[PDB]
Design a protein around this motif. Structure first.
Motif, mmCIF file in Angstrom:
data_model
loop_
_atom_site.group_PDB
_atom_site.id
_atom_site.type_symbol
_atom_site.label_atom_id
_atom_site.label_comp_id
_atom_site.label_asym_id
_atom_site.label_seq_id
_atom_site.Cartn_x
_atom_site.Cartn_y
_atom_site.Cartn_z
ATOM 1 N N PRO A 147 1.666 -59.865 10.247
ATOM 2 C CA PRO A 147 0.611 -60.430 11.070
ATOM 3 C C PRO A 147 -0.151 -59.361 11.844
ATOM 4 O O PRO A 147 0.161 -58.179 11.947
ATOM 5 C CB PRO A 147 1.433 -61.315 12.006
ATOM 6 C CG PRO A 147 2.679 -60.501 12.310
ATOM 7 C CD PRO A 147 2.948 -59.960 10.911
ATOM 8 N N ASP A 148 -1.311 -59.821 12.324
ATOM 9 C CA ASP A 148 -2.297 -59.178 13.174
ATOM 10 C C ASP A 148 -2.955 -60.097 14.192
ATOM 11 O O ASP A 148 -3.520 -61.117 13.810
ATOM 12 C CB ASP A 148 -3.290 -58.572 12.191
ATOM 13 C CG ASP A 148 -4.284 -57.529 12.682
ATOM 14 O OD1 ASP A 148 -4.369 -57.317 13.911
ATOM 15 O OD2 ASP A 148 -5.073 -57.061 11.837
ATOM 16 N N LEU A 149 -3.132 -59.644 15.434
ATOM 17 C CA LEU A 149 -3.749 -60.363 16.532
ATOM 18 C C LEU A 149 -5.152 -59.903 16.893
ATOM 19 O O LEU A 149 -5.828 -60.592 17.663
ATOM 20 C CB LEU A 149 -2.847 -60.385 17.762
ATOM 21 C CG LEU A 149 -2.397 -59.035 18.301
ATOM 22 C CD1 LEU A 149 -3.461 -58.294 19.100
ATOM 23 C CD2 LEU A 149 -1.270 -59.245 19.305
ATOM 24 N N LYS A 150 -5.585 -58.808 16.271
ATOM 25 C CA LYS A 150 -6.898 -58.204 16.447
ATOM 26 C C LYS A 150 -7.302 -57.776 17.841
ATOM 27 O O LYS A 150 -7.488 -56.586 18.093
ATOM 28 C CB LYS A 150 -8.005 -59.061 15.836
ATOM 29 C CG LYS A 150 -7.709 -59.661 14.462
ATOM 30 C CD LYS A 150 -7.657 -58.723 13.259
ATOM 31 C CE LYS A 150 -7.154 -59.475 12.025
ATOM 32 N NZ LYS A 150 -6.984 -58.578 10.873
#
Lengths: 48, 112
Positions: free
Chosen positions: A1-4
């Motif tokens: 995952p990534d939250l930016k």
């Protein structure tokens, strides 16, 4: 995952422009005018 | 030594009334047969004028309390002009306590 990007909500980060700012105080003093004043009894010139 | 002004020709007012002094009910009191009642006119009141001159000026400069007099119908000039009168009274009482001796102006040389 990534939250930016993600950030906090809401407090001291939204306050950083408003200190608030302070002020100034002053007295509270005067004089009176004495320039008109003479004594109200007055016989000593009668020596004339 | 019980001190009058230099200028005083006649300083007194004397009276005789036949009815005595009589006290009240309700004390351990002195039923005397005779009494005096005195009033003194003197420059000694000029010591307690000087106290009113002291009390006034510390309050009135700082303008302490004056808004209580304002708000119930009073001019500021009223205080000022009363203390002006006290500035006169101070001197009205000083032009008396002086000795009656005569002269004016300025000199530095001989006549003789």
């Amino acid at each position: 995952p990534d939250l930016k990007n993600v950030k906090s909500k809401i407090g001291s980060t939204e306050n950083l422009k408003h200190q608030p700012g302070g002020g100034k105080v002053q007295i509270i003093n005067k004089k009176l005018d004495l320039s008109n004043v003479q004594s109200k009894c007055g016989s000593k010139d009668n020596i004339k | 030594s019980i001190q009058f002004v230099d200028w005083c020709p006649t300083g007194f007012k004397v009276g005789i009334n036949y009815q005595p002094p009589t006290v009240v009910p309700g004390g351990d009191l002195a039923k005397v047969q005779r009494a005096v009642c005195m009033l003194s006119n003197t420059t000694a009141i000029a010591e307690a004028w000087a106290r009113l001159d002291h009390k006034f000026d510390l309050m009135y400069a700082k303008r302490a309390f004056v808004h209580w007099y304002v708000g119930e119908g009073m001019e500021e000039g009223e205080f000022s002009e009363a203390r002006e009168d006290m500035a006169a009274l101070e001197k009205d009482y000083e032009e008396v306590g002086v000795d009656s001796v005569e002269g004016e102006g300025e000199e530095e040389g001989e006549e003789y």
